[PDB]
Structures are given as structure tokens and as C-alpha cells.
Amino acid sequence: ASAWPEEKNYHQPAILNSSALRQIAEGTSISEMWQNDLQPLLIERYPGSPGSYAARQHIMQRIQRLQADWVLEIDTFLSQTPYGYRSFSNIISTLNPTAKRHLVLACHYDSKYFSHWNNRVFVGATDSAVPCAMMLELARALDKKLLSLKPDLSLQLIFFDGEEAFLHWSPQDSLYGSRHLAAKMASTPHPPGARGTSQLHGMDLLVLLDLIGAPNPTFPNFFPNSARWFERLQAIEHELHELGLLKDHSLEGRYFQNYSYGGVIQDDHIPFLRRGVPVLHLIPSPFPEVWHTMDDNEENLDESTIDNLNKILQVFVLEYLHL
């Protein structure tokens, strides 16, 4: 009876030296992400809308053009909603599908439904078009390194549909995509042919990005079972800062501070966390001031903060994967 599902508990990062950190900082482009990955998503894209389809096509096309061996799957399903039965489509992009373990980065790609108000449309810039674009830019910036994966551990990206409630949040009206996919993964043997382990046992850590893009975010260290990885984010931020590789950044105003948050925040990680998956929840507290407002738009995004977080996240992923 293999103990491979316990490997995540002992897994250590292979830390990047200064020259490597400079390389990663120089290898990501916030302007290229802005134009090529973010702007196409700054559209109305609630579940079932034409924008949802356009966003899904955009995400798939951007991953498909990369050199690394990404396997794309669209997870389409039905769920009851306040408006009756509807269809949803999660997007899953995986390197090395049969590898037993994967580090998983995720966000939601739907935008919350609002009827147009005074010619304004809700595009959820921080919620979560930026997180989507950050995952796409990470796949692009790290493409050559990721191509080398073509330690039975690889990378998976999940873009969840239906994170938002169609009305105001309620237990049944929210997290459509993640509740569905967590249950599906929990009931899927992994690796292929396994007798008693599932795709959830294979999830080393779920890094969920949400509500990113506003100025001065502060991310709490939510869970004891992922605290050591939160500490790695702190260390990476600190070293990138000291090497002069972050923009308009101070340690007093750092993003990963020493502070927990005992409360519960409902988000896409919940169906995974309640099935035992370790989660690093990259959601700020407090939420952006523009949260669930028509002002959650492009103009209110903080470019340098997103650039800095892209560098931090890319170093984190390379260190985790030993790349």
C-alpha cells in the first residue's frame, strides 16, 4: 500500500539563487500580459453568456499556443440555479496527466451577473480577470522551463466557472464549478488504474488566486497545513524586494504579512478543503474597495502590484517544481 499521497507533506522547495531570481523577474512582462491575456477577459462573462464562451476560447487559445505539453479539458455539467437548470464549463489545463502529483493553481473565470446599470457592465477586473491573466502569463513566462517536464510531480491550472452566486451568496447558489469538480476529482481514481487513491489525493496543494489587482493587498496565512508555503511566499517577496526586483514596493507595505485569519471565507477552495486538500488561499483581506461594484474595472487595477505578484508566484511555482 504505497505512501505516495504523503509525499506532499515532506516536499521541500529547490530555492532559486540571486541570478535565477533576476532571470525570473526579467522574464515576465506585465505589459504583454495586460494586452494579450488580460484585456480580452475584461468583458461580461457570467455563466452561459456569450462572454463566457469567448473567455473560455481565449484561455484555451492562449494555453494552446505554448510549447509545453498542456492537455486541455473542458468539464461541462448541469446544475440547478435560482434561474433553473443551467450549464457550466470548468477549464482544466494539465502538464503530465498521469503524473501522480500536481501543484494546482486556480481561479474563477466567470464574472458575477448584473443587469446593465446606466450603460455600465460588470467585468470583475480583480474578480477574477487579473488572476486568470496571471495564470496565463505564468504559463507563458515559464514555458521553456515547463517544456522540460515533458519527483512524479507536475503542474495543473484550473479556471472555475460559476464561482459567483446568480443572486446574493447562499450555500446552494455559489461555487457551481468547484463543487462539481471537487466531487468529480474525489471520485476519479488516480493515477489511472489505482485501487484506492483519487485525483484529490494527487493534489499536492491548491493555490487559489482571487480578488487580486487592487493597491496594497494583504494576504492572511489562513491554514496551518499550508503555513510553511505561505512562509515561502514571504521569503520570496522579501528576497525579490532586497534584490531590487519589485516595483513601488516596501517591506512595511508587503503583501504577505504575519497574521492569520480565523474566520472562513467562502470561495472555490472550500469543496477541496473539506475533502482534505491543502490550500494556500491567495485572497486579500480586506477585499478590494471596488468589490462587487462597477468600479472593479481596468482603471482601478494597480499594475506594479500585479507585476510584483507575478514575479513572486512564478518563483514559488519554479521552486515547488524544482525547475
Ligand X SMILES: CC(=O)NCCc1c[nH]cn1
Cα angle 270-176-42, degrees, rounded to a multiple of 5 = 100
| Closer CB to ligand X, 101 or 112, in the complex | 112
Whether 298 is catalytic is no
Determine the size of the site formed for ligand X (CB under 6 A).
6
* Chain residues that interact with Zn ion, rule: CB under 5 A: 127
What is the closest distance, in whole angstroms, from the C-beta atom of residue 113 to ligand X in the complex? 12
Residue 267 interacts with which of Zn ion, ligand X, none, CB < 5 to 8 Å by class? ligand X
What is the closest distance, in whole angstroms, from the C-beta atom of residue 169 to ligand X in the complex? 6
Rounded CA Rg of the chain? 19
> Which position among 161, 163, 204, 267 bears the catalytic label?
163
What is the closest distance, in whole angstroms, from the C-beta atom of residue 292 to ligand X in the complex? 7
| Closer CB to Zn ion, 109 or 229, in the complex | 109
6 is in an annotated binding site: no
Sign of the Cα torsion 146, 147, 152, 155 reads positive
> Which position among 161, 204, 210, 268 bears the catalytic label?
210
Q: Output the residue with the shortest Cβ distance to Zn ion.
A: 127
| Closer CB to ligand X, 127 or 307, in the complex | 127
Among 44, 237, 239, 267, binds ligand X (CB under 6 A): 267
Sign of the Cα torsion 243, 248, 250, 254 reads negative
Q: Mark the segment that binds ligand X (CB under 6 A) among 16-24, 54-62, 239-247, 262-270.
A: 262-270
265 binds ligand X (CB under 6 A): yes
Whether 163 is catalytic is yes
Q: SS3 letters for the chain?
A: CCCHHHHHHHCCCCCCCHHHHHHHHHHCCHHHHHHHHHHHHCCCCCCCCHHHHHHHHHHHHHHHCCCCCCEEEEEEEEECCCCCCEEEEEEEEECCCCCCEEEEEEEECCCCCCCCECCECCCCHHHHHHHHHHHHHHHHHCHHHHHCCCCCEEEEEEEECCCCCCCCCCCCCCCHHHHHHHHHHHCCECCCCCCCCECCCCEEEEEEECCCCCCCCCECCCCHHHHHHHHHHHHHHHHHHHCCCCCCCCCCCCCECCCCCCCCCCCCCHHHHCCCCCEEEECCCCCCCCCCCCCCCHHHCCHHHHHHHHHHHHHHHHHHHCC
What is the closest distance, in whole angstroms, from the C-beta atom of residue 111 to ligand X in the complex? 10
What is the closest distance, in whole angstroms, from the C-beta atom of residue 130 to Zn ion in the complex? 12
CB 237 within 8 A of CB 255: yes
127 binds ligand X (CB under 6 A): yes
| Closer CB to Zn ion, 127 or 302, in the complex | 127
| Closer CB to Zn ion, 174 or 226, in the complex | 174
231 is in an annotated binding site: no
What is the closest distance, in whole angstroms, from the C-beta atom of residue 158 to ligand X in the complex? 15
| Closer CB to Zn ion, 66 or 265, in the complex | 265
173 binds ligand X (CB under 6 A): no
Q: Using CB under 6 A, which residues numbered 177 to 216 contact ligand X? A: 210-211
26 is in an annotated binding site: no
Residues making contact with ligand X (CB under 6 A): 127, 210-211, 265-267
Catalytic residue annotation = 163, 210
Instruction: State the binding site for Zn(2+).
Output: 127, 164, 292
